[PDB]
Design a protein around this ligand. Structure first.
Ligand SMILES: [Cu+2]
Ligand SMILES: [Cu+2]
Ligand SMILES: [Cu+2]
Ligand SMILES: [Cu+2]
Length: 442
């Protein structure tokens, strides 16, 4: 009963000039009683808009920095050239504006955007910076999936935050937060503590994004009803995958369909995970993150038998292999002995060519959601075992926790030395403290 309403991020479309304006500004959010928490946000006090882009169409994104300090703006999941990626090299100084030219050339998905500031990514994402990218294509539009934005097509950004006694965001990059990660005693759903959403009877499409810096989540329904996964990080699956529990890693996106035809209210809950530090209350028990309340009104959605033509995984056979050994040994966080050196991109990749990448987390029991820039790949092996049905489509993240993972990457866009792609552990504090690397595509 005593709960807020789930905020819906505005659906911005490119204007008459084919441009989208993003003003990265300061603000505040009222979480602690009688305490305005200073936060950061794109076009608001926290988080940002959902940029709706069409496949094939172009857009110029005018990112204005209105913060007191420098920031960047990465477009997580976009298959774009390194010159438009917005990594730690594309620095937007305070009061300045950087433009990112993007030509959409990938399937329909829920991609996202967040800063990628050198050694400061975690801090700025925790401050409140984040947003969505809704990609549309003809193939996906034909499907009878819920399309009414903010009504039956709903974004769900799940981030945890920690506040100090004065209400301020408590973020210190000490040795503990640099090793286990930054986590908090407060769960947010679109920057709101356990909000409610009114949905039509029929089907409800939830675009889940785990926006936590370090916390992994395990989504499920309170009354055991199924979650039908229809999409992953980079597109819809071949056909829906019926799941009860949906583990979602930091930076990952999953589009799920929920049956609301019965008209009964229920919660989207997250289950306790066996990750270090992520066990403490309120995460000690099942935690409701979003309350779905079906209305009397209804939609004509169907949950199709087949979604899109998911291509077969090509047997690489003779491709250039890669070895990325993640290490939290002795001195600190590093990949292949080298802690992230921006001046030296590990290797060059021939554009348009397949490769077989192998990431290793052996001799380390920490969780590493390995994220690769400028691509959407197919997981060949996830932590030894083959990828789950819902994790076998288009992914830009792969689980690396204790053993080794192997994916089939291919980069269709260039990335010069000056604006090289990044590959890193999406546990933001690991990335900031060295567990990141660069590579060029030509
Ligand atoms: Cu990211
Ligand atoms: Cu990325
Ligand atoms: Cu890591
Ligand atoms: Cu990144």
């Amino acid at each position: 009963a005593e709960h807020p309403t789930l905020p819906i991020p505005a659906l911005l479309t490119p204007d008459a000039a084919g441009k989208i304006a993003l003003n990265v500004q300061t603000g505040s959010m009222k979480w602690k009683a009688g305490m305005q928490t200073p936060t950061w946000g794109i076009n608001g006090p926290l988080l940002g808009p959902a940029m709706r882009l069409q496949r094939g169409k172009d857009v110029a994104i005018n990112v204005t920095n209105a913060l007191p300090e420098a920031t960047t703006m990465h477009w997580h999941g976009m298959e774009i050239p390194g010159t438009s990626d917005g990594g730690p090299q594309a620095v937007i100084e305070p009061g300045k504006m950087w433009t990112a030219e993007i030509k959409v050339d990938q399937p329909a998905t829920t991609a996202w955007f967040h800063p990628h500031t050198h050694g400061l990514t975690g801090r700025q994402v925790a401050m409140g910076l984040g947003g969505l990218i809704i990609i549309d294509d003809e193939e996906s539009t034909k499907l009878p999936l819920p399309k009414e934005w903010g009504v039956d097509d709903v974004p769900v950004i799940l981030q945890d935050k920690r506040l100090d006694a004065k209400g301020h965001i408590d973020y210190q990059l000490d040795i503990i937060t640099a090793a286990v990660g930054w986590f908090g005693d407060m769960m947010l759903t679109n920057g709101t503590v356990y909000p409610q959403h009114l949905a039509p009877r029929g089907w409800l499409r939830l675009r889940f994004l785990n926006g936590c810096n370090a916390r992994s989540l395990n989504l499920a329904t309170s009354d055991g009803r199924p979650l039908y996964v229809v999409g992953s990080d980079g597109g819809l699956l071949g056909e829906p995958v019926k799941l009860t529990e949906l583990p979602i890693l930091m930076g990952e996106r999953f589009e799920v369909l929920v049956d609301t035809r019965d008209g009964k209210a229920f919660d989207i809950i997250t289950l306790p995970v066996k990750q270090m530090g992520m066990t403490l209350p309120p995460f000690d028990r099942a935690l409701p993150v979003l309350h779905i309340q079906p209305t009397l009104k209804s939609n004509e959605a169907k949950l199709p038998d087949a979604l899109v033509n998911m291509p077969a995984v090509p047997a690489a056979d003779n491709v250039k292999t890669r070895w990325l050994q993640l290490m939290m040994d002795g001195g600190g966080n590093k990949i292949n002995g080298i802690a992230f050196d921006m001046a030296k991109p590990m290797f060059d990749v021939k554009r348009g060519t397949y490769e077989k990448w192998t990431i290793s987390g052996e001799g380390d029991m920490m969780l590493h959601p390995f994220h690769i820039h400028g691509t959407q790949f197919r997981i060949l092996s996830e932590n030894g075992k083959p990828p789950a049905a819902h994790r076998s489509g288009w992914k830009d993240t792969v689980r690396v926790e204790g053993w080794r993972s192997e994916v089939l990457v291919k980069f269709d866009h260039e990335a010069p030395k000056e604006r090289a792609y990044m590959a890193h552990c999406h546990l933001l504090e690991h990335e900031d403290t060295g567990m990141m690397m660069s590579f060029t595509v030509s």
